[PDB]
């Protein structure tokens, strides 16, 4: 059974998703079988109350492009015990992307995929452009790292 998955704790944890990024954020919940399940998106600079649970796993992505985002400065978010009944913050931010990855984001936003190969670049960068960021590949990378 998949390593990265929420546990069925049945222990409520009040959370507030706080989008501190300029992107439209897609919160993605890993269900009890490790399958990613999307929750409604958050406009930039907005926040939202969630009823989640102890030991559930979340990650967060640009809704339009699936660029990775950070939550409390890391890849994954796990709601904890509500200490003194106070909700937990999930602060969603931009990472410091590599200059390369950031250039790829901008070129992707301007060029339709059918036309990537009509740009005057070397072979390796076409591949790079085509290899869109992807939740499923991120989970496989995280699982491998966690072994």
């Amino acid at each position: 059974r998949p390593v990265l998955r929420s546990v069925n704790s049945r222990e409520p944890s009040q959370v507030i998703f706080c989008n501190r990024s300029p992107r439209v954020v897609l919160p993605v919940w890993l269900n009890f079988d490790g399958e990613p399940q999307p929750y409604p998106t958050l406009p930039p600079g907005t926040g939202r109350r969630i009823h989640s649970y102890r030991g559930h796993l979340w990650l967060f992505r640009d809704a339009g492009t699936h660029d990775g985002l950070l939550v409390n400065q890391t890849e994954l978010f796990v709601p904890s015990l509500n200490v003194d009944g106070q909700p937990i913050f999930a602060n969603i931010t931009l990472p410091v992307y590599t200059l390369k990855e950031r250039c790829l984001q901008v070129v992707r936003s301007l060029v339709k995929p059918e036309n990537y190969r009509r740009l005057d670049i070397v072979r390796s960068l076409y591949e790079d452009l085509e290899d869109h960021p992807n939740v499923q590949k991120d989970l496989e990378r995280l699982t491998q790292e966690r072994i």
Binding site: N8, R10, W29, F32, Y39, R48, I50, H51, H56
Partner: peptide, 10 residues
Amino acid sequence: LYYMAPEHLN
């Protein structure tokens, strides 16, 4: 089995 997924019930 009694699965409770997160809600936007909030």
